[PDB]
Design a protein that fits this description.
about 130 residues; Ubiquitin Conjugating Enzyme; elongated; RWD domain-containing protein 1
Length: about 130
C-alpha cells in the first residue's frame, strides 16, 4: 500500500497495467479482440463433471470510461452446454461481485467467481 493513493485515480493506466499481466497469466486463455477501445475475451472451462462434463462460456470484457471507477462491461458472446437459465445465473452473480469490487480492476476476480459457478453447474447436471 503506497502512502496516499487517495483521490486522483488513473483509469487509462490501471487497465494497461492489468492487461500486461493477463498476457502472461493467460497465454492461450486470453485473446485481445480490440484495442481502442481495448476489448478482450477470456476462456474458462470447468473440470470434468460426474460424467466427464465440461462447459465453456466466452466472456467479453470491455474497458469503459469509468474503470475501475465503475463496473466494466460483461457480456456472453458464446456459450456451450448451458441454458438461458444457467447462463443468467452466471450473470446475476457477477453483478454482486463486480458491484462489491467497484473501485478497482475486477478482471482476475470475476473469472475466479465464474469458474466456480461453471464447476457447480456442470456438476449439478450429474443429477439428471
Amino acid at each position: 500500500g503506497s502512502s496516499g493513493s487517495s483521490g486522483m485515480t488513473d483509469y487509462g493506466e490501471e487497465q494497461r497495467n492489468e492487461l500486461e499481466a493477463l498476457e502472461s497469466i493467460y497465454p492461450d486463455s486470453f485473446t485481445v479482440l480490440s484495442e481502442n477501445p481495448p476489448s478482450f475475451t477470456i476462456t474458462v472451462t470447468s473440470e470434468a463433471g460426474e460424467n466427464d462434463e465440461t462447459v465453456q462460456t466466452t466472456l467479453k470484457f470491455t474497458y469503459s470510461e469509468k474503470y475501475p471507477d465503475e463496473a466494466p462491461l460483461y457480456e456472453i458472446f458464446s456459450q456451450e452446454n448451458l441454458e438461458d437459465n444457467d447462463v443468467s445465473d452466471i450473470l446475476k452473480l457477477l453483478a454482486l461481485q463486480a458491484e462489491e469490487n467497484l473501485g478497482m480492476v475486477m478482471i482476475f476476480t470475476l473469472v475466479t467467481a465464474v469458474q466456480e459457478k461453471l464447476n457447480e453447474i456442470v456438476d449439478q447436471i450429474k443429477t439428471r
